[PDB]
Design a binder for this molecule. Structure first.
Ligand code: HEM
Ligand code: 7DF
Length: 397
């Protein structure tokens, strides 16, 4: 009898921690310790997918005196309209109503074309340079920040201003750094909303300003833009790094994709499903029970914290045969959980898929000999950031 304690050790730089796979083998749900409060950990695909669609399980904390959070997590939860359990239903509903139509088929079609040319240009610069090159700096970081510049209608050079702000806002190890960085994000976005009020374009804030004959306050609009800025590039950067690392580990699938870029959508779904870094703390979706819920033979009581392990569920042999294997030839694979599911299903997921598809359509066709210039074990996953990630990916080609 030994209460398991999150985060679990991972001897590899990717994948799921052995202890979490061991718990998954025993059953769908276990009581675990964490850095803060104890929580129920749900590790099997069927139960994680079910609980994500259960409206009794919500982001907001209903408890009368809530456990303390890092500044980073508090900012995250506020950007997701989960900071007040009494107003979360109306506020979260409004958030999704206002953001979903910003990712229209018209906008996505136009952005796919620009994304494709941009990747072409990024790879031509990469191919013209002398190895070793940091693939994270010159490819992974550059495409998703370009996309956010396009969404917000700002010059591309602005990403050199905001490109580290998600990392800094979400630094759980330094409350003061987190708050100072979020203040910069806020100041920037308020500047931007004031400009878009007199100089609109074909971009997200201009559409928010025009919404409901202009009924939204500057604070309301900047909130929504901050969510786009802070959720809209960093996680995608990390998936380009993880997808590259995964394809480097699987040369047969990599050669298949290089030969047939029509496999890129399938590859991207495998990358999302298998792409978990380090101790994988970002592959947990946190919730609180707002009513009692029975999971198998376990009773989750109102007020309990629940960690929905989307990473472990995406590796679950019960949902994906040979769940640990990268196989872009899977026939009708189940929908992975990397974007979540239910009420908070990732608003940007179609755009993120467009970005990743454009990259991996091209990468190994344009640079067939691309490979790591350093050992895998020297790559350092950044555990203190809510979004994790690697700081550099040195390559040769
Ligand atoms: C590969 C890249 C991405 C991954 C893996 C990812 C993953 C996720 C996940 C798992 C959630 C649900 C969190 C929860 O249920 O607590 C989420 C929510 C969200 N995502 Fe994404 N995301 C990605 C990219 C993006 C992009 C590109 C955008 C927009 C430009 C975006 C905007 C959002 C927003 C606004 C939410 C909040 C939805 C809500 O709370 O209702 N994300 N994302
Ligand atoms: C709004 C988010 C940025 C979306 C998810 C992406 C995930 C990641 O970075 O992989 C990040 C980590 O922390 C979480 O609570 C997650 C899992 O819900 C998120 C929060």
């Amino acid at each position: 009898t030994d209460l398991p304690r999150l985060p679990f050790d991972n001897p590899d730089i990717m994948g799921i921690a052995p202890q979490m796979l061991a718990l998954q083998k025993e059953g769908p749900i276990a009581r675990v310790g964490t850095a803060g409060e104890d929580a129920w950990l749900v590790t099997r695909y069927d139960e994680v997918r079910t609980l994500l669609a259960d409206r009794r399980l919500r982001l907001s904390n209903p408890n009368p005196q809530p456990s303390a959070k890092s500044a980073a997590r508090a900012f995250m939860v506020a950007l997701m309209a989960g900071d007040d359990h009494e107003t979360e239903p109306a506020r979260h509903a409004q958030m999704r109503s206002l953001l979903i139509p910003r990712f229209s088929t018209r906008r996505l079609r136009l952005m796919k074309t620009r994304i494709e040319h941009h990747v072409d240009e990024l790879l031509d610069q990469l191919a013209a340079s002398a190895p070793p090159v940091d693939l994270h700096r010159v490819l992974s970081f550059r495409l998703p920040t370009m996309v956010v510049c396009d969404l917000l209608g700002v010059p591309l050079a602005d990403r050199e201003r905001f490109g580290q702000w998600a990392r800094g806002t979400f630094d759980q190890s330094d409350n003061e750094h987190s708050a100072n960085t979020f203040q910069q994000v806020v100041d920037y976005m308020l500047e931007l909303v004031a400009r878009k009020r007199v100089e609109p374009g074909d971009d997200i804030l201009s559409e928010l300003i025009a919404e409901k004959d202009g009924a939204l306050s500057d604070a309301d609009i900047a909130h929504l833009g901050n969510a786009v800025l802070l959720f809209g590039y960093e996680t995608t950067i990390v998936r380009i790094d993880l997808g590259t690392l995964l394809l480097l580990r699987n040369p047969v699938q990599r050669a298949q994709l290089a030969e047939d870029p029509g496999l890129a959508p399938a590859a991207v779904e495998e990358i999302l499903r298998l792409g978990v870094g380090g101790k994988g703390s970002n592959a947990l979706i946190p919730r609180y029970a707002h009513g009692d819920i029975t999971v198998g033979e376990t009773v989750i009581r109102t007020g309990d914290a629940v960690m929905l392990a989307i990473g472990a569920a995406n590796y679950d042999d019960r949902a994906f045969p040979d769940g640990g294997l990268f196989d872009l030839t899977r026939v009708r694979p189940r929908s992975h959980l990397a974007f979540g599911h239910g009420a908070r299903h990732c608003i940007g997921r179609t755009l993120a898929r467009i970005e990743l598809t454009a990259v991996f359509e091209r990468l190994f066709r344009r640079l067939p000999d691309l490979r790591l210039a350093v050992p895998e074990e020297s790559l350092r996953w950044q555990e203190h950031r809510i979004t994790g990630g690697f700081d550099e990916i040195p390559v040769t080609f």
